[PDB]
From a paper:
The action of histamine is mediated through four subtypes of G protein-coupled receptors (GPCRs), H1R, H2R, [name], and H4R2. [name] is expressed mainly in the brain and acts as an auto- or hetero-receptor in the histaminergic neurons. As an auto-receptor, [name] modulates the histamine release by the negative feedback. Therefore, [name] is a potential target for the treatment of neurologic and psychiatric disorders, such as sleep disorders, Parkinson’s disease, schizophrenia, Alzheimer’s disease, and cerebral ischemia.
Here we determine the crystal structure of human [name] bound to a non-imidazole antagonist PF-03654746 at 2.6 Å resolution. To obtain the stable human [name] proteins for structure determination, the flexible regions of the N-terminal residues 1–26, intracellular loop 3 (ICL3) residues 242–346, and C-terminal residues 433–445 were truncated, and a thermostabilized apocytochrome b562RIL (BRIL) was inserted at the N-terminus. The [name] structure consisted of the canonical seven transmembrane helical bundles (TMs1–7) connected by three extracellular loops (ECLs1–3) and three intracellular loops (ICLs1–3) with an amphipathic helix 8. In our [name] structure, PF-03654746 occupies a shallow pocket at the extracellular side, with clear densities for both the receptor and ligand. At the extracellular side, the carbonyl and N-ethyl-carboxamide moieties of PF-03654746 extends into the EBP by forming hydrophobic and hydrogen interactions with E3957.36 and Y912.61, respectively. Notably, the fluorine atom of 3-fluoro-cyclobutane of PF-03654746 engages a hydrogen bond with C18845.50, and the amine moiety of pyrrolidine of PF-03654746 forms a salt bridge with D1143.32 at the bottom of the pocket, which is highly conserved in the aminergic receptors. In our structure, the electron density of a cholesterol molecule is observed around TM1 and TM7 of [name]. Especially, the β3-hydroxy head group of cholesterol interacts with E3957.36 through hydrogen bonding. Our functional assays showed that mutating the negatively charged E3957.36 to uncharged alanine or positively charged arginine had little effects on the histamine activation, while completely abolishing the PF-03654746 inhibition, indicating that cholesterol binding to E3957.36 might not be critical for agonist binding and [name] activation, but might potentially to affect antagonist binding and [name] inhibition through an allosteric mode. Indeed, the pocket volume of PF-03654746-bound [name] (calculated by the CASTp 3.0 server) was similar to that of the doxepin-bound inactive H1R, but increased by ~3-fold in comparison with the histamine-bound active H1R, which is in agreement with the expansion of the extracellular binding pocket in the inactive state of H1R. Together with the intrahelical salt bridge observed between D3.49 and R3.50 in the DRY motif, and locked state of Y7.53 in the NP7.50xxY7.53 motif, these conformational changes resulted in an inactive state of [name] in complex with PF-03654746.
Author numbering:
A (entry chain B): 1 to 106
B (entry chain A): 27 to 241, 347 to 432
The structure:
Amino acid sequence: ADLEDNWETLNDNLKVIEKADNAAQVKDALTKMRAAALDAQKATPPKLEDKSPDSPEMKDFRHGFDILVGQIDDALKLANEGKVKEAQAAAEQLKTTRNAYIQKYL
Amino acid sequence: RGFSAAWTAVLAALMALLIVATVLGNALVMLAFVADSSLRTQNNFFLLNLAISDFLVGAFCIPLYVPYVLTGRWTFGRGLCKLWLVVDYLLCTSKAFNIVLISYDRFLSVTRAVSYRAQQGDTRRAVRKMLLVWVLAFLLYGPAILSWEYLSGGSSIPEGHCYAEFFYNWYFLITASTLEFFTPFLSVTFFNLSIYLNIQRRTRLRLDGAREAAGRFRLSRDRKVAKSLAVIVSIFGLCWAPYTLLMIIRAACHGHCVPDYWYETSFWLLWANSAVNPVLYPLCHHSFRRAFTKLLCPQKL
Ligand SMILES: CC(C)CCC[C@@H](C)[C@H]1CC[C@H]2[C@@H]3CC=C4C[C@@H](O)CC[C@]4(C)[C@H]3CC[C@]12C
Ligand SMILES: CCNC(=O)[C@H]1C[C@@](F)(c2ccc(CN3CCCC3)c(F)c2)C1
């Protein structure tokens, strides 16, 4: 449920970013998303309580989160130059990476 | 979502028993309509209607959901998602709206007994009332499921899972919840209370030797009809109320006070009712004890 709660955090911060207007709000939301993502990456999904870390499913779960962290960091890069619009547009792509790669394992 | 190998093995076993129990139980009920043509009554047809819905929860709704709870993924395309959704929402409100109809038919048989006697063998009238019910049931969720995505300019349901496009729309959910719960619960409460008062009144009625003697026999029959109705209405109420009540509460706290697994537990309690009904018909009705005899143990002659 810490994985459930880290997913909670990803949701709340992604909507702040739709809703924001300045770079600081967008930055804080992403730094939060990132922390939650690194935390969620170390989780063992309920589905997988019975699998090795070298298991194809557990490597794939963790690669979904590599995509995500990296996408959050691209958007931090843009936010950390005051490009609020680019950084907000990049936030949409997070939704794709979540559904396609991570949501399976929840 | 989903479950480890060890847990899916224990849940699949249990999910399967429920499937077999629901399917066999309602097939047996339907085969008893075939065996015994004395079950050609409106009251009986209203119970047949409940057994059809129940058959379909077993044959269609539970089976398509099993893989989805076990693994967390709907693997059948959104097309089959919409059909399964329509049919699950349809069988829910149909069962509910049919308990209303059964309760009305029983209220007329005690409170309007002599008018009811003439109408009772009229199965064409019965089959037309059940059809109207299927349309009314469909109307509550059917169009909203099929149309919300286009009205809302696209789906908010990732290709992973299967939910009604209105399922995080609180405004729709509060008015559908409250209708779905109160229409049936207040109508059903009224008929049953009204049967109780009718019997209590006639019991305290002061009649001569033959009229009194004729009407304690007719009151013995009414008292039995009232038990029968209370038992099925109660067991439905206790299977259906948690799900109906939780939806009303999810919608009124905008999804912030009800964990997913509460309402997902409640699904099984409501679907479990479909296994139970087959056993209640012969427990509570002569006509079904007679039919099951004609089918399974006709040696009684
Ligand atoms: C004995 C047989 C006939 C009855 C079958 C009972 C089985 C099918 C029912 C009873 C309890 C139900 C579980 C109760 C709660 C949950 C939590 C929910 O989040 C996922 C489904 C799950 C895990 C249900 C799965 C199905 C379940 C195990
Ligand atoms: C947790 C895996 N996903 C689900 O359980 C989804 C929740 C879901 F959208 C759903 C299906 C059917 C209904 C309606 N059913 C009517 C009878 C019991 C519940 C829902 F309220 C919700 C299926």
